Design a binder for these strands. Structure first.
Length: 109
RNA sequence: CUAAGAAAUUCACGGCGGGCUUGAUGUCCGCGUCUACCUGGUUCACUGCCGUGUAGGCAG
């Protein structure tokens, strides 16, 4: 999770729908699993569901920066696609977990 | 049209003081190395060489 790190309680509340449920970790479907705890009006329920779905979405516009490592890749006989590679945070956290399994812990030691 | 394009790491400094490495010792026994060969351009179209001077008597 990336952003202002003072609202970590909201991500903690939205991060319990997969540890024993089918409405927060599986909130892409299951409208019964979405309405299983709301009990409020339909407008406030729809606004809360939209706000909960907008936690793994875009920031507002597709925007790069002048300090963001853009590149040209050449096509077979034609012009170009511009390529803006990003940093794989998830993959490198997976590989840091695998390297601490392989270098440290208790069994490898 | 390249994880694209940019970039001052800087100043200064006491490593010192001491010290027993010792004692002992079997390297031994044995053996088939043969077979054959042209250094022959002028080891200079040259060192001493009538003129060093494409002319010459020139240990040719």
């Amino acid at each position: 999770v990336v952003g202002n790190a003072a609202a970590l309680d909201v991500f903690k509340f939205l991060s319990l729908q997969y540890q024993g449920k089918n409405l927060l970790n599986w909130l892409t479907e299951d409208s019964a699993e979405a309405l299983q705890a709301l009990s409020d009006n339909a407008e406030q329920a729809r606004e809360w569901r939209q706000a909960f779905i907008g936690i793994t979405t875009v920031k507002g516009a597709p925007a790069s920066h002048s300090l963001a490592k853009q590149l040209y890749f050449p096509l077979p006989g034609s012009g170009y696609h511009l390529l803006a590679p990003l940093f794989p945070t998830s993959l490198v956290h997976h590989v840091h977990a695998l390297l601490r399994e392989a270098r440290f812990g208790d069994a490898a030691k």
